[PDB]
């Protein structure tokens, strides 16, 4: 006589409710972290948004590869329960320590004098690459905030999700997980903006962004502990299926040719192609957008309030479009839904670049909407990222996870951990490498925006050419 509250069994409810509530808390922290990490490195003194091309390739990329190897080594020395804590607790300690301890000490540990000497000896083109050494502690926060979205959002959660959840519940409640975790963006974006509004209490003296950063990093710990408490509960009071595997345990002792196995497949060879094409294109657009952001919001608090507003808008757009996807998929197909994201990103990016390039003459409409050309660029790039990233979260990520179904059950576990951890940073680092070569070749990033559009078309025209290759092979493992 098991009850079926809301038509859903009360035994599965004890498994799904704390799981979507966890993914709510996980994306609540990431919304604070991924917003603060941009406020931290872009609006610092002596740094610009041109640090981002160099942050992602030389700092964020090898630390993601370094974490992959450490997490893979940690997977075969700790239990599944212990592996979750030993990955997520150091994140909680770091962000809590950064708010309360490491950020106030930044003025003591940041070599602002040695970097200003490098800036003169090496010139204006190198403000970006030198800025990594100025605010290296803020650059470490950047990679840790980047690793939260790649490990906690993707590896830690979905690894625990796909373990306790059956295939039938994963087809019914996973779409609800994204819906409830975009309410997290709406609420954490309001949280980022609320705690970014300068108190104006004690206008002189105490840093306004310091009290802002301490309040938010306190929530990151509190909402991060909620992830650990929601994890302790499902593992103690919810029956774990321990579903029987089909393969032997003999696949082991692989640390270097696991990558060779993962690249031998012409299937993962196109999954990774899509996961890099997105990330290359998104970087190519968003680094320029964030340069416009720094030009428009120079103080950390203005930038953080705008990032909170932008996070709320991203949450609402992604909620709407995750509601629309569950009709787009059924009506059209995987191949059309895999075309929507590259096309929307390409069109939004070319519209943004054709406003940075060919909008100066078309200033009449910019003034008509009561804006400056820079504010118009800021809002157009904000819409670019909102549309592209909501499109991702609602069709590309569903298309990605709807392609791992016809595989082995051990290739997928360490394959879409690999794909995430070293293909999202890999794609964004490829885009960042393009942008940083163009920075060191043409001086500023503003001189490089005509060539950003040509490269954007090349990556997208292969993004579609690789989705069709995966489509013609996602269709051929079906009737």
């Amino acid at each position, epitope marked *: 006589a098991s009850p079926k509250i809301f038509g859903v069994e009360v035994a599965t409810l004890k498994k799904i409710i704390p799981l979507g509530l966890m993914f709510f808390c996980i994306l609540f922290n990431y919304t604070i972290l991924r917003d603060t990490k941009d406020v931290l490195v872009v609006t610092a*003194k*002596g*740094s*610009s948004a*041109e640090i981002i091309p160099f942050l992602k390739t030389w700092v964020n990329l090898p630390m993601a590869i370094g974490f992959m190897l450490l997490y893979t080594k940690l997977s075969n020395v700790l239990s599944k329960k212990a592996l979750f804590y030993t990955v997520i607790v150091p994140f909680i300690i770091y962000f809590g320590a950064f708010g309360f301890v490491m950020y106030p000490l930044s003025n003591y540990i940041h070599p602002e004098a040695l970097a*200003d000497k490098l*800036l*003169t*000896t*090496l*010139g*204006p*083109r190198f*403000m970006g690459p030198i800025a990594i050494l100025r605010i290296w502690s803020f650059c470490l926060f950047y990679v840790m905030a980047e690793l939260w979205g790649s490990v906690v959002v993707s590896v830690l959660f979905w690894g625990f999700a796909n373990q306790i959840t059956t295939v039938d519940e994963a087809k019914k409640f996973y779409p609800l997980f994204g819906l409830g975790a975009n309410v997290a963006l709406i609420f954490s974006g309001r949280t980022v903006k609320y705690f970014s509004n300068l108190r104006k209490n004690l206008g002189p003296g105490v840093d306004g962004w310091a009290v802002s950063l301490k309040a938010m990093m306190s929530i990151v710990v509190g909402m991060g502990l909620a992830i650990c408490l929601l994890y302790w509960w499902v593992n103690r009071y919810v029956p774990l299926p321990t579903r029987s595997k089909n393969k032997k345990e003999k696949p082991k002792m692989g640390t270097m040719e696991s990558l060779k196995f993962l690249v031998s497949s012409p299937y993962i060879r196109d999954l990774a192609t899509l996961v890099v094409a997105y990330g290359i294109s998104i970087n190519l657009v968003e680094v320029t957008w964030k340069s416009k952001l*720094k*030009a428009q919001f*120079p103080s950390p608090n203005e930038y953080s309030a705008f990032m909170g507003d932008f996070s709320t808008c991203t949450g609402v757009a992604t909620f709407t479009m995750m509601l629309l996807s569950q009709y787009v998929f059924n009506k059209y197909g995987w191949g059309v839904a895999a075309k929507i994201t590259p096309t929307v990103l390409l069109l939004t990016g070319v519209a943004f670049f054709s406003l940075i390039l060919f909008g100066g003459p078309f200033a009449p409409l910019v003034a008509k909407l009561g804006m400056t050309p820079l504010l118009a660029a800021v809002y157009v790039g904000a819409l670019q990222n909102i549309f592209s990233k909501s499109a991702k979260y609602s069709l590309f990520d569903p298309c990605k996870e709807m392609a791992y179904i016809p595989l082995d059950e051990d290739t997928k576990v360490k394959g879409k951990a690999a794909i995430d951890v070293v293909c999202n940073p890999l794609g964004k680092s490829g885009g960042a490498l393009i942008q940083q070569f163009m920075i060191l070749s043409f*001086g*500023s990033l*503003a*001189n490089s925006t005509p060539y950003l559009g040509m490269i954007l078309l090349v990556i997208v025209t292969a993004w579609l050419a690789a989705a069709k290759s995966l489509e013609g092979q996602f269709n051929s493992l079906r009737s």
Partner: nanobody
Amino acid sequence: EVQLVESGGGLVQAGGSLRLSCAASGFPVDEAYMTWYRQAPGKEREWVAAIYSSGYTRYADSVKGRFTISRDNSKNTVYLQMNSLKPEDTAVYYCNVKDYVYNTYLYDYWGQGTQVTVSS
């Protein structure tokens, strides 16, 4: 076609204030690395202040805290606000747009300078 014209220099008492103006033509000042130099008769040209396209400001130790370099994008002008002027600040101040990589100077455009004199 790049030109820099300086203005605002003049006589002030010790401890007074001035605002040197740099009207630039042929390039946007927000995309440029702008600097203020000063040269007094009998001494070599001395770098005073610098502003970057990112808005980052750098100052010499002798003027740090008293001088402030900024720019107006709409006017395409670079300003040097000189407060608490000492008699040792008397020099011809040059505004300069510049670009270089390590020691290869891609372009280097100067102004004709403006005289700043601090009385005693």
